[PDB]
Design a binder for this molecule. Structure first.
Ligand SMILES: Cc1cc2nc3c(=O)[nH]c(=O)nc-3n(C[C@H](O)[C@H](O)[C@H](O)COP(=O)(O)O)c2cc1C
Ligand SMILES: Cc1cc2nc3c(=O)[nH]c(=O)nc-3n(C[C@H](O)[C@H](O)[C@H](O)COP(=O)(O)O)c2cc1C
Lengths: 312, 312
């Protein structure tokens, strides 16, 4: 039995990694992810300069998941580049870096700095097109003209295979429009579906008050809320972008959800809210649970069922 | 305490009604809604000609809500107009009709027929801009140019106060854009937030198969999945459209959820998945539970706390 994944020139021990933003902001965070049983890890979505993010409280755990408006707190691109170049143990597992400049000009500058490190170390880029908690900045993925600009400029500046973190789409027309843009950029090798369901609102009935401070309580939803949306996006892009990989992100708490993501077409599976709740020990549990499901169904590899969801 | 709502010249006994599509397709359905303790009712989203809708299975109840791809099965506009004109007991409660033509032309033809019945009986129009389960028909509400056309032509053709059923939005820029369109049409007196979270996917791990037949398993999500999205949309439009009412729809299972909707700014509160689960007895329960919360908090009327959610 094997959870191994062969993509992007690497052998991943298993399909699991952290979702960008969870357990990956500091050196200590990244150490714990590297020491975990995860198949990979991704750094916090970074900007050209450091950010401390939004005021508190900006995170609230829910029965059915989480709401957050973190506001992209990060140590700046130079920190994560230095981590990728000097600190990270590539013998343990491959490294992704998430980059989320607040303009195309910022992104271009950032990805240019990554080029030499990708060439030297093999660090992988995930371009974030769906940061929903920065006041005054719309999610790039919801504007297909802006998305096309970003992909053109980053393709030009970076010039190596990279991936994109997409916001969730809720309309067949949007899947079609999104795929049409993505399919025009051959350097986009993977699509991560999905980021948080943006701009939800949670109110405490007792004090009649919102539970987070930023943006009048509006924040991104994660966890059990997002699983059906996540599976739909994974499967939609799996079918619409056959020349690209799809990574699943959203609502993974168990091997069962991981199995569903992979069945829908996911190559790798990212874990956000559940990891925030449980800590990096979750990866050991997820490996065991996924292996259990496969044993019960008589599958030896992930390849036996990846993307083999049945329709009626 | 009083649950009464006084809007559009009508007295509503309480803020509760069915969500369009649930318990409102047939004459018997509408009878049961009229007999219930609900403050109002709305007819199934109808088309110019009858429709039998999508093939089976097209509905699946979930632990956390529902997925459906009904495909607007309805008896045609003539049936609902006849119900509104001849059958409905207006002494029991006011009636809304939902109209969901698959083109602006169809919608215009339908609303023209309603005009004399509105004038005579006081039937209220909810124009559906968010039908997500018709193959080849995108949700109108996600195209602001198309939305503007619909509101223009329907405003002209109907010429009386009406409301709109909106799809959920997930970006602040979209709230701004939607509100800019809506605020140009003074005849739009209410906004219903929200329709289903469109195009989710549920997969059964046992048989590795999607749970509904239409559109490769893709269907609208309702129930516990949608509450934070619903509250966000209600509050966003409550603040952006001060010349209009907002109706809340999504994730109502209890008086507590109803309270949150009203706190967010809802005038009426619609019940979909929970009503499908429980039957029209739910309306008696909802009245009791909301009265209890208001008694506990010392609120004499809904107007004491409507839209008075606190931010930090
Ligand atoms: C605290 C927190 C921080 C996050 N930070 C980022 C981030 O920096 N970049 C990003 O692309 N997504 C970020 N996300 C979104 C997650 O990567 C993920 O897409 C989302 O939480 C859905 O997965 P889940 O259901 O497992 O939580 C963050 C989510 C949380 C809860
Ligand atoms: C079986 C079913 C049929 C529906 N039919 C319609 C419809 O005809 N028109 C409409 O605007 N919404 C329709 N909806 C959406 C609901 O009106 C409502 O917006 C959605 O279910 C969210 O509310 P809930 O969380 O209480 O279910 C339907 C939903 C379900 C579950």
């Amino acid at each position: 039995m094997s959870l191994k994944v062969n993509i992007l020139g690497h052998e991943f021990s298993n399909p699991f990694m952290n979702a960008a933003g969870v357990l990956c902001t500091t050196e200590e965070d990244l150490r714990r992810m590297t020491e975990s049983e995860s198949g990979s890890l991704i750094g916090k979505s970074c900007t050209l300069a450091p950010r401390t993010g939004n005021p508190e409280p900006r995170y609230f755990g829910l029965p059915l998941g989480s709401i957050n408006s973190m506001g992209l707190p990060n140590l700046g691109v130079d920190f994560y580049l230095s981590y990728a170049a000097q600190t990270h143990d590539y013998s343990r597992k491959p490294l992704f870096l998430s980059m989320s400049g607040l303009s195309v000009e910022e992104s271009v500058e950032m990805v240019k700095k990554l080029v030499p490190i990708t060439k030297e170390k093999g660090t992988i880029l995930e371009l974030n097109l769906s940061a929903p908690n920065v006041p005054g900045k719309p999610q790039v993925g919801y504007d297909f003209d802006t998305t096309r600009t970003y992909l053109q400029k980053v393709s030009e500046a970076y010039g190596l295979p990279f991936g994109v973190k997409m916001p969730p789409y809720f309309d067949i027309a949007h899947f079609d429009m999104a795929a049409a843009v993505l399919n025009d950029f051959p350097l986009v090798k993977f699509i991560t579906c999905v980021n948080s369901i943006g701009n939800g609102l949670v109110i405490d009935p007792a004090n009649e008050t919102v539970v987070i401070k930023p943006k009048q309580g509006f924040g991104g939803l994660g966890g059990k809320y997002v699983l059906p949306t996540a599976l739909a996006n994974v499967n939609a892009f799996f079918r619409r972008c056959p020349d690209k990989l799809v990574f699943g992100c959203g609502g993974v708490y168990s091997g069962e959800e991981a199995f569903l993501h992979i069945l829908a077409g996911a190559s790798m599976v990212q874990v956000g809210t559940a990891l925030h709740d449980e800590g990096p020990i979750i990866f050991a549990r997820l490996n065991k649970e996924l292996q259990e499901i496969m044993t019960n169904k008589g599958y030896k590899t992930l390849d036996e069922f990846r993307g083999r969801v049945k329709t009626m």
